[PDB]
Design a protein around this nucleic acid. Structure first.
Lengths: 389, 102, 49, 57, 243, 54, 46, 33, 96
RNA sequence: CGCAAGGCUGAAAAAUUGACGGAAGGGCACCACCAGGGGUGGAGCCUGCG
């Protein structure tokens, strides 16, 4: 309630940094111009409920008009058998309503980068009507396999071990009727907590893009969709790379309660390019529009084009994973951390992130040349509550 | 009549158990319902789904039989006991909750 | 004043009928051990299985 | 869509999802046609002519 | 001096000096975090208070009073910060104690333990226990005297026994926080013994609670008492001979 | 072991007694008295069972 | 209902605890015995 | 198509675990026995 | 080990801190990391009342164990430069 | 450690022996006849079940 924010840009990032630094915040003027549906979005209020379930001692207050919330932060407890679930290994359930349009990866990136500072493990299980696990059009949120093989290697670089990260889907869903809809359930078992994340050095040039691996998923359509998408991607990328390999996954359909109905039919593709240097990976994805019915050949060509744009653009991290690696950089110890961005990669969201870090109390960023090198000063808070043995 | 014999008589009236008709008989039928009939038959021939009085009403009054579903009632009350008692047993010691005034 | 006053009936060790008020157990929430396996109540899932 | 497998499919024509497979005739279903005018409010009705001497609406 | 839970204590931890009142606790057998009432002599017990957070593995000290008239060793306790949390789970034993009323071979009615059939029907199916070691179960409320109940035990309990029920009541510390602004001036909360010596109240004691010596006579039993029909009917080889 | 505990570890725990408001009913039966009762009653039941078999 | 829920919780919790510490005891005994046998062989060679 | 990757590459990517970056009767005696 | 008699190490994790019975061997054992090799071994603290004394990330000296988990070879002799038996007997205060 | 572990896909038969009956003739039944008896159901108390 002390610190002051405005606007709805990077709402989850503001909440997550408030929770990490323990600085109590007040976000005013959420949707002031939109008199049709002013105030909070349903994905935002579901994110509030998720954060309140995972935390402990957090007092969140949404005002009457809902255009302003306050947040006094508690501690990141996790799923303890006394407070959040019944067993130490029991998955905390989370249900989000059918009126959701943003992706479960938009729900999941804040949860993942808030996970390794917890007390116990994280066993969060997202079910419910509105859980879309594919790419969304929206503001182009990632897919689940994009999220996994495109940002969890970064925690593996930090030292949060990928052998003990555990993320699994059980049903897959695309958007469905309109932007709303879904059905797929996911669950996430962070069994790896750290005290202080290791400061890192992405400095050496990631020149030779070695290999390209990916996934083509279909939920409700024939396998010919993914196979034509594979022909598209390989016909566009065989001019440059010989080892492109894209798996294909097919799920029947997800069923949603109202007397169930089958929803969330769609098809999408996710590409990952792995550099020979180190954990440097460029990811892109594309989903069919939820009512369009467009050519899978066109979708394969479109996603291959987006991947090649991120290839020619990026320094060492892509634009979707830049804020996560930067906030974990700032979470790191009281040292400088050396990240190599590309000149085209800096975004208004990233500049807003730097603004919010300066506002909260993390030290600044020093920028120089080598694409450009940013050097973050970590604060070294680490996890507040962890039973030392 | 017995349960078995009444059930067989009801199914022969419903045409689900009858003798194997010819193609001519199938033509006659296709020349010339059973879902609601079958649901009534299962409801009436599994009578321990619901608690019933044998004597009937004590004093007959005319104006214009099940008396409760114990299995359905137990499942509903157990679901309510889930969503209240198991919830508080999980959040036995939990400080601070979202205050939603909208 | 709270420290010098007499402890409550809960924070005493040995509570009985003359000590505590009438339905104070209804007011309270504690835990205790149980014995024996309770009888499995019939549910529609058990009957359907 | 009527096959010689004695059955027809209803497809959604966006993403090509089989809205319903349905078996309805003892022989090969030969021809299937809709009714075009929805001005009576019945544009999603269709007839199927089948080699076992049947029209099914 | 030993130090009691609930009693104030001035902690020196990080930069802050701050007087707070902790809650001492043992970790009973790595299950339940039982609340103590005094710290054990020469043992590490789990303390817990309400104060400002510090990252773990940070050692710290504990005084009782910053006076110079203290004739010996002002520092009281040491230790290291184990972790932090909100909404602790401290647990104290509550012993609901009754008394047998009528005693059959196994089942026994118990009187001075409950006040109403409501409370008993809350505690139905409960694991009651005697002092002798006989386990047992609270089974069903009784009706005619309001509050009595029926328990099924293992073997025959005696009218001299006492039935106890061992429940776990949750205790939460108090959220006191002095800062010890010693250069400016500050109010130091006195302890228990000082409060009692100040406003002249004697320390509470129960004559039921103080330890005494028991006088056990040598327990002799009655001899065997065979029923008449059995002793008449058994064969000649084992007929009892009683002059 | 046995040299890895202090004398305060070895200190015996005192046995509580019957409350003074209930001393008239006899001695408070603790574990040892209970074992005496169980041995005596089980022995008498054993001999009575053997006589019933006979 | 509280009887049933607490019995299920206690059973699953005791099962998980027993399984985990069986694993940990076996692993530590395995590693320590392997090193002890390696040292016994490297000592017997002198 | 040749998008079919491998059993190993499926185990790396489509698994639940995220892919880490930090990897790259002779003789008569024996007959009688 | 090595060629020496007493090796130094860091307490990595007091594994078996959540055992039930107090003097269980899994309760007493402590996983450490020998400095001279960077190796991971496991050592015994002589009593649970002194497992309370050993703290995480402390320069812990250990030696041989000559006589429930047969095969643990090392036992803790010093913690942070102070004799562990004296710590348990409450002779010296542990310098941290 | 490896196999199991790659989705023309999207919830609601056998028969030379088989299916269902009908007519006659038997046997059994205080869930049938026959002769009687006794409950409950009227008023109040309450466990229990819905």
């Amino acid at each position: 309630e002390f610190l002051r924010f405005t606007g709805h840009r990077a709402f989850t990032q503001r909440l997550v940094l408030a929770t990490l630094y323990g600085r109590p915040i007040h976000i005013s003027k959420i949707r002031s111009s939109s008199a049709t549906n002013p105030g909070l979005a349903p994905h935002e209020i579901s994110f509030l409920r998720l954060l309140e379930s995972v935390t402990n001692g957090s007092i969140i207050d949404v005002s009457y008009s809902g255009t302003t919330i306050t947040y006094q932060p508690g501690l990141i407890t996790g799923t303890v058998p006394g407070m959040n679930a019944s067993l130490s290994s029991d998955a905390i359930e989370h249900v989000i309503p059918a009126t959701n349009t943003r992706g479960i990866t938009y729900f999941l990136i804040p949860l993942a980068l808030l996970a390794p500072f917890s007390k116990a493990h994280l066993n969060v299980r997202f079910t419910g009507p509105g859980v879309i696990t594919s790419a969304t059009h929206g503001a182009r949120d990632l897919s689940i396999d994009t999220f996994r093989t495109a940002v969890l290697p970064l925690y593996g670089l930090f030292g949060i071990p990928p052998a003990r990260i555990e993320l699994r889907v059980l049903q897959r869903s695309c958007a469905g009727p309109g932007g709303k809809g879904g059905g797929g359930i996911v669950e996430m078992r962070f069994a790896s907590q750290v005290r202080l994340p290791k400061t890192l050095h992405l400095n050496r040039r990631p020149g030779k893009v070695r290999r390209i691996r990916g996934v083509a998923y279909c939920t409700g359509v024939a396998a010919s969709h993914n196979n034509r998408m594979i022909t598209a991607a390989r016909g566009v990328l065989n001019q440059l790379v010989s080892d492109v390999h894209i798996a294909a996954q097919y799920d029947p359909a997800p069923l949603v309660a109202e007397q169930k109905k089958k929803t969330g039919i769609g098809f999408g593709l996710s590409l990952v390019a792995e550099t020979s240097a180190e954990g440097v990976i460029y990811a892109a994805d594309e989903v069919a529009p939820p009512e369009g019915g467009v050519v899978p050949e066109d979708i394969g060509e479109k996603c291959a084009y987006q991947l090649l744009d991120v290839i020619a653009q990026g320094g060492c991290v892509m634009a979707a994973s830049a804020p996560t690696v930067l906030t974990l950089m700032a979470m790191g110890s009281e040292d400088v951390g050396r990240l190599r961005l590309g000149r085209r990669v800096v975004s208004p969201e990233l500049l807003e992130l730097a603004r919010d870090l300066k506002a909260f109390g993390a030290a600044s960023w020093g920028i120089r040349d080598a694409d450009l090198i940013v050097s973050v000063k970590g604060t070294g808070v680490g996890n507040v509550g962890r039973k030392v043995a | 009549g017995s349960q078995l014999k009444r059930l067989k008589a009801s199914l022969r009236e419903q045409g689900l158990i009858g003798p194997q008709k010819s193609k001519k008989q199938k033509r006659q039928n296709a020349n010339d319902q059973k879902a609601e009939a079958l649901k009534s038959i299962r409801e009436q021939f599994n009578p321990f789904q619901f608690k019933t009085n044998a004597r009937g009403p004590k004093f007959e009054v005319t104006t214009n039989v099940i008396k409760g579903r114990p299995e359905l009632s137990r499942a509903r009350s157990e679901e309510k006991r889930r969503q209240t008692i198991l919830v508080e047993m999980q959040r036995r010691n939990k400080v601070g909750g979202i205050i939603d005034r909208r | 004043a709270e420290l010098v006053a007499k402890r409550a009936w809960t924070l005493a060790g040995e509570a009985t009928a003359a000590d505590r008020p009438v339905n104070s157990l209804l007011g309270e929430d504690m835990e205790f051990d149980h014995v024996g396996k309770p009888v499995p109540v019939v549910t529609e899932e058990v009957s359907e299985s | 869509t009527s096959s010689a497998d004695k059955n027809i499919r209803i497809w959604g024509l966006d993403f090509g999802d089989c809205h319903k497979a349905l078996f309805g005739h003892q022989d090969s279903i030969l021809q299937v046609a809709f009714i075009p005018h929805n001005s009576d409010g019945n544009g999603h009705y269709f007839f199927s002519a089948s080699k076992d001497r049947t029209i099914k609406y | 001096k030993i130090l009691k839970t609930g009693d104030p204590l001035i902690f020196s931890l990080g930069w802050r000096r701050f007087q707070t009142l902790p809650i001492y606790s043992i970790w009973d057998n790595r299950t339940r975090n039982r609340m103590l009432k005094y710290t054990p002599e020469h043992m590490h017990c789990f303390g817990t208070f309400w104060g400002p957070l510090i990252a773990p593995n940070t050692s710290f000290c504990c005084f009782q009073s910053f006076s110079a008239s203290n004739p010996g060793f002002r520092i009281a306790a040491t230790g290291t910060v184990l972790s932090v949390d909100e909404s602790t789970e401290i647990v104290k034993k509550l012993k609901l104690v009754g008394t047998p009323w009528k005693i059959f071979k196994n089942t026994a009615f118990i009187k001075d333990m409950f006040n109403s059939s409501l409370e008993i029907a809350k505690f139905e199916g409960a694991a009651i226990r005697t002092v002798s070691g006989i386990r047992g179960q609270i089974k069903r409320a009784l009706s005619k005297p309001e509050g009595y109940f029926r328990a099924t035990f293992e073997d025959k309990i005696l009218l001299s026994d006492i039935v106890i029920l061992k429940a776990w009541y949750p205790v939460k510390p108090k959220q006191f926080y002095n800062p010890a602004t010693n250069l400016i001036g500050w109010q130091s909360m006195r302890l228990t013994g000082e409060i009692r010596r100040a406003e002249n109240i004697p320390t509470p004691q129960n004559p039921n609670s103080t330890y005494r010596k028991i006088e056990r006579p040598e327990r002799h039993f009655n001899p065997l008492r065979v029923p008449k029909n059995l002793a008449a009917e058994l064969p000649f080889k084992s007929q009892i001979v009683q002059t | 072991m046995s040299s890895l505990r202090h004398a305060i570890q070895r200190r015996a725990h005192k046995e509580r007694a019957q409350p003074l408001e209930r001393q008239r009913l006899g001695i408070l039966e603790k574990k040892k008295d209970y074992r005496l009762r169980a041995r005596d009653y089980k022995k008498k039941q054993a001999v009575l069972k053997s006589l019933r078999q006979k | 209902f509280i009887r049933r829920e607490q019995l299920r919780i206690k059973k699953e919790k005791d099962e998980a605890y027993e399984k985990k510490f069986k694993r940990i005891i076996a692993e530590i005994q395995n590693e320590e015995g392997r090193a002890a046998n390696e040292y016994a062989r490297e000592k017997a060679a002198r | 198509a040749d998008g079919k990757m491998s059993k190993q590459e499926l185990k790396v990517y489509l698994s639940s675990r995220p892919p880490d970056p930090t990897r790259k009767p002779e003789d008569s005696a024996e007959l009688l026995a | 080990f090595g060629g020496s008699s007493h090796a130094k190490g860091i307490v990595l994790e007091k594994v078996g801190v959540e055992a039930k019975q107090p003097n269980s061997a899994i309760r007493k054992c402590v996983r450490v990391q020998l400095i001279k090799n960077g190796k991971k071994v496991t050592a015994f603290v002589p009593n649970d009342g002194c497992l309370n004394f050993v703290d995480e990330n402390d320069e812990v000296l250990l030696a041989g164990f000559g006589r429930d988990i047969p095969g643990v070879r090392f036992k803790v002799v010093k913690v942070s430069g102070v004799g562990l038996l004296a710590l348990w007997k409450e002779k010296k205060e542990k310098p941290r």
